[PDB]
Amino acid sequence: PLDVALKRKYYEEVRPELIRRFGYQNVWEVPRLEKVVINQGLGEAKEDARILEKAAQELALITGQKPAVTRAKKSISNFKLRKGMPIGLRVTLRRDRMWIFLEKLLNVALPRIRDFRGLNPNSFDGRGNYNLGLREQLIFPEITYDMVDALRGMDIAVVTTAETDEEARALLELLGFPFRK
Amino acid sequence: PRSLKKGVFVDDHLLEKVLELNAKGEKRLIKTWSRRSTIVPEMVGHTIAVYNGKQHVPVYITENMVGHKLGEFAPTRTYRGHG
Amino acid sequence: MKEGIHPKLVPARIICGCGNVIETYSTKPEIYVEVCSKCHPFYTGQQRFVDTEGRVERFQRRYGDSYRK
Amino acid sequence: ARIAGVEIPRNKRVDVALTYIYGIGKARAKEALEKTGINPATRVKDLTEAEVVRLREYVENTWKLEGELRAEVAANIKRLMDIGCYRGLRHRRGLPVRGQRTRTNARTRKGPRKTVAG
Amino acid sequence: GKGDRRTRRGKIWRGTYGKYRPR
RNA sequence: GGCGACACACGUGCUACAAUGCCCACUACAAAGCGAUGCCACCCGGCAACGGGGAGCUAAUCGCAAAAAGGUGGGCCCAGUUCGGAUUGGGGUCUGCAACCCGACCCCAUGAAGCCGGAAUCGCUAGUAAUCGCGGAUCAGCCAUGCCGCGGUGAAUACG
RNA sequence: CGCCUCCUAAAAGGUAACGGAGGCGCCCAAAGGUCCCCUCAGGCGGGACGGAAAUCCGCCGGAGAGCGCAAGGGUAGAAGG
Ligand SMILES: [Mg+2]
Ligand SMILES: [Mg+2]
Ligand SMILES: [Mg+2]
Ligand SMILES: [Mg+2]
Ligand SMILES: [Mg+2]
Ligand SMILES: [Mg+2]
Ligand SMILES: [Mg+2]
Ligand SMILES: [Mg+2]
Ligand SMILES: [Mg+2]
Ligand SMILES: [Mg+2]
Ligand SMILES: [Mg+2]
Ligand SMILES: [Mg+2]
Ligand SMILES: [Mg+2]
Ligand SMILES: [Mg+2]
Ligand SMILES: [Mg+2]
Ligand SMILES: [Mg+2]
Ligand SMILES: [Mg+2]
Ligand SMILES: [Mg+2]
Ligand SMILES: [Mg+2]
Ligand SMILES: [Mg+2]
Ligand SMILES: [Mg+2]
Ligand SMILES: [Mg+2]
Ligand SMILES: [Mg+2]
Ligand SMILES: [Mg+2]
Ligand SMILES: [Mg+2]
Ligand SMILES: [Mg+2]
Ligand SMILES: [Mg+2]
Ligand SMILES: [Mg+2]
Ligand SMILES: [Mg+2]
Ligand SMILES: [Mg+2]
Ligand SMILES: [Mg+2]
Ligand SMILES: [Mg+2]
Ligand SMILES: [Mg+2]
Ligand SMILES: [Mg+2]
Ligand SMILES: [Mg+2]
Ligand SMILES: [Zn+2]
Numbered sequence: 001p002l003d004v005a006l007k008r009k010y011y012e013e014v015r016p017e018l019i020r021r022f023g024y025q026n027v028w029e030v031p032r033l034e035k036v037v038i039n040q041g042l043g044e045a046k047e048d049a050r051i052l053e054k055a056a057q058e059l060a061l062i063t064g065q066k067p068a069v070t071r072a073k074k075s076i077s078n079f080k081l082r083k084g085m086p087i088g089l090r091v092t093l094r095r096d097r098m099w100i101f102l103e104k105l106l107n108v109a110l111p112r113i114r115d116f117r118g119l120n121p122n123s124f125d126g127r128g129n130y131n132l133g134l135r136e137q138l139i140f141p142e143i144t145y146d147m148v149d150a151l152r153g154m155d156i157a158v159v160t161t162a163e164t165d166e167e168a169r170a171l172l173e174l175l176g177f178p179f180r181k
Numbered sequence: 182p183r184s185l186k187k188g189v190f191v192d193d194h195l196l197e198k199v200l201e202l203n204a205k206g207e208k209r210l211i212k213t214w215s216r217r218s219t220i221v222p223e224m225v226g227h228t229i230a231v232y233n234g235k236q237h238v239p240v241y242i243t244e245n246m247v248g249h250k251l252g253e254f255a256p257t258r259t260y261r262g263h264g
Numbered sequence: 265m266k267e268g269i270h271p272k273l274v275p276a277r278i279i280c281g282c283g284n285v286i287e288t289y290s291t292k293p294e295i296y297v298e299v300c301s302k303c304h305p306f307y308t309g310q311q312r313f314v315d316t317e318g319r320v321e322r323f324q325r326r327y328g329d330s331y332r333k
Numbered sequence: 334a335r336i337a338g339v340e341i342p343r344n345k346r347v348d349v350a351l352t353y354i355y356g357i358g359k360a361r362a363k364e365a366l367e368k369t370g371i372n373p374a375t376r377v378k379d380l381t382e383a384e385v386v387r388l389r390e391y392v393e394n395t396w397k398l399e400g401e402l403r404a405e406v407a408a409n410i411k412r413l414m415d416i417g418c419y420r421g422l423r424h425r426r427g428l429p430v431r432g433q434r435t436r437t438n439a440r441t442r443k444g445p446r447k448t449v450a451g
Numbered sequence: 452g453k454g455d456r457r458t459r460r461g462k463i464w465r466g467t468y469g470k471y472r473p474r
Numbered sequence: 475g476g477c478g479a480c481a482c483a484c485g486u487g488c489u490a491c492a493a494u495g496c497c498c499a500c501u502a503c504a505a506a507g508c509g510a511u512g513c514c515a516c517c518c519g520g521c522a523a524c525g526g527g528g529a530g531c532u533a534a535u536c537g538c539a540a541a542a543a544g545g546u547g548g549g550c551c552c553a554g555u556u557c558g559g560a561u562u563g564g565g566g567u568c569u570g571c572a573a574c575c576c577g578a579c580c581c582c583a584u585g586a587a588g589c590c591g592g593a594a595u596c597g598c599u600a601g602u603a604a605u606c607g608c609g610g611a612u613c614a615g616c617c618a619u620g621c622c623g624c625g626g627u628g629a630a631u632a633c634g
Numbered sequence: 635c636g637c638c639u640c641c642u643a644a645a646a647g648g649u650a651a652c653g654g655a656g657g658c659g660c661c662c663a664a665a666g667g668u669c670c671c672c673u674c675a676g677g678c679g680g681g682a683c684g685g686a687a688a689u690c691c692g693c694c695g696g697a698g699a700g701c702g703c704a705a706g707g708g709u710a711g712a713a714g715g
Contacts, residue, residue, distance in 0.1 A: 039690035061291050066269045088689040100289050107286055108278050108297055111304040114338050115400040131681040141278055141295040153682035157691040188331045217572050222323035234475025246416045247323045252574040253419045263481040281386050314397040406563050435480050441561045449482050454489050454559050469522050
């Protein structure tokens with residue numbers, strides 16, 4: 001397995017501090033990191049364009065994994081969308097690729113956001129998970145201004161083994177998630 | 182605006198009112214016509230009834246309205262709308 | 265891991281304007297950025313930018329006082 | 334995000350390209366060139382990376398720009414609107430603030446004409 | 452044009468002086 | 475305090491929509507006027523408005539006063555742009571007892587509509603039209619892009 | 635005016651009225667055979683554009699979903715994807 005610094009840091013500085021703060025008696029009680037799911041609800045590629053290919057190529061470069069197409073479950077007139085048409089993309093990152101992506105996000109992606117003042121501390125799921133929303137894709141290091149044709153955002157789902165928000169919050173700040181006061 | 186080589190202008194008849202209040206029971210209701218008088222930090226806390234040309238409007242002074250003039254807080258025209 | 269559909273990841277470096285070098289794996293073996301986590305103002309404590317005076321909007325000027333008290 | 338999170342256009346001179354940043358005008362686009370030792374006659378596409386990084390650092394350290402400036406302006410307008418200032422009242426209704434006539438003209442504030450029955 | 456205060460032409464139109472139209 | 479309002483409608487104008495142009499530096503060439511609680515040379519300080527000293531002139535003597543379009547050189551290269559300068563935020567100067575309603579000007583930032591205008595309608599026959607600047611009355615100051623004057627450059631066409 | 639479903643119909647079947655309610659006169663080349671895999675509707679909380687409602691994540695939820703078209707029967711230990 002690739003020696004990622006973020007995974008190294010979790011096992012060296014984060015795990016011993018977590019057991020200090022919360023007093024887990026089992027080495028498997030301490031919250032772990034399960035997976036990261038990145039979803040792109042395009043919605044503009046229903047029938048007006050097959051521009052899913054442009055976003056699939058960009059998403060594969062950022063995460064190293066080719067994403068999968070998600071189709072509409074039903075037809076809605078107000079969105080002018082039919083059942084079964086492709087209206088999104090999704091990629092799931094686990095193990096080494098999960099650690100690699102978060103290291104880039106915390107270090108070279110989030111600092112490039114316009115007027116960054118920290119992450120939302122009230123976005124915790126309530127059972128130990130976190131979700132954040134991005135408006136721009138050019139903040140990632142592998143994306144340059146030249147091949148950017150349209151602006152696109154994404155939702156990032158961070159899933160942990162923590163049971164409560166307070167234990168999931170502690171893991172994330174030590175890992176490097178910066179939060180607003 | 183006024184030049185900083187000159188001091189900020191107060192009519193000296195309302196300044197006497199707030200100053201005399203500040204050492205003699207400093208809270209009452211003053212009626213004034215000096216809309217051109219500039220609010221002073223000492224005036225904070227007072228309720229001043231400022232003429233709009235027809236009536237005295239009560240204005241309660243706070244910190245973030247210190248450098249303005251009293252007349253800016255008593256509108257002189259009633260509009261609502263057309264129709 | 266399916267074959268032929270995933271960009272192969274290679275060891276890579278990301279160089280920031282402040283000289284910071286972050287070591288990771290990416291699809292591009294050399295990346296340059298303009299801001300990183302070690303120089304962004306929100307991360308280095310406060311790093312007060314061109315705005316640092318707290319807006320000084322209160323009576324904190326004293327506006328002379330050369331007039332009569 | 335090249336300078337202050339914005340992309341100044343290529344094929345234009347540096348002084349002309351700098352003015353494309355919210356909060357940077359021609360006067361500041363000359364000041365930022367007379368304090369970083371860079372020729373205004375050159376194009377942005379032809380710049381040494383040292384020049385670009387030094388110019389970016391100096392510009393982002395000297396002047397409040399872009400979203401921070403917008404926040405400052407909006408906060409000032411909110412301060413005027415909240416305290417019941419006359420300028421605040423005219424900011425609520427979208428009417429001219431600097432004492433212009435409103436019987437005619439005043440179209441930049443009021444928008445398109447809304448003809449009624451006379 | 453003549454409506455711009457930050458030019459020689461505009462200052463001439465307004466009949467004033469300054470940085471852009473020195474005396 | 476109002477005559478300065480503001481869902482709208484009309485008249486008269488000003489500024490533009492650009493390369494027969496815009497910006498920057500240097501460099502020419504007028505006329506008619508005004509000036510003693512006035513006109514202010516020159517020097518100093520501030521990017522500047524302007525402020526502090528301070529001559530000369532009751533003025534064919536001294537000042538306003540710089541004329542501008544022009545000429546030379548450079549920059550911009552067809553874009554809502556180095557076109558256009560409305561609106562708004564901030565910092566200031568001056569007049570005035572006092573610039574909030576409701577003054578003018580300087581500097582920084584903001585950089586709206588506008589790509590030559592529907593039915594229609596106006597002026598002008600020669601130093602005229604067009605275009606460029608300058609002075610005066612009222613006036614502490616000025617909302618003058620108005621009015622009354624002055625000169626610079628200088629057309630087209632009239633068959634009938 | 636023939637055919638299908640429910641009630642009337644009196645707990646086997648059958649049972650009338652110009653009694654009470656609804657459908658059919660098709661369709662599918664896969665909506666057929668088999669093998670393999672999978673499991674809903676809904677509610678609550680979180681998430682760029684994005685909402686009552688698009689796509690994504692977590693939790694509860696045993697069939698209240700779905701099964702081309704009426705109704706009834708049946709059905710997730712599948713007949714549903
Ligand atoms: Mg969890
Ligand atoms: Mg700019
Ligand atoms: Mg009138
Ligand atoms: Mg008005
Ligand atoms: Mg008329
Ligand atoms: Mg007109
Ligand atoms: Mg005009
Ligand atoms: Mg422009
Ligand atoms: Mg211009
Ligand atoms: Mg006034
Ligand atoms: Mg437009
Ligand atoms: Mg054009
Ligand atoms: Mg007409
Ligand atoms: Mg004639
Ligand atoms: Mg006019
Ligand atoms: Mg029969
Ligand atoms: Mg039949
Ligand atoms: Mg029976
Ligand atoms: Mg039986
Ligand atoms: Mg029976
Ligand atoms: Mg019978
Ligand atoms: Mg019978
Ligand atoms: Mg019958
Ligand atoms: Mg019957
Ligand atoms: Mg039926
Ligand atoms: Mg039928
Ligand atoms: Mg049939
Ligand atoms: Mg068939
Ligand atoms: Mg079938
Ligand atoms: Mg079947
Ligand atoms: Mg059912
Ligand atoms: Mg039917
Ligand atoms: Mg059924
Ligand atoms: Mg069922
Ligand atoms: Mg089951
Ligand atoms: Zn850095």
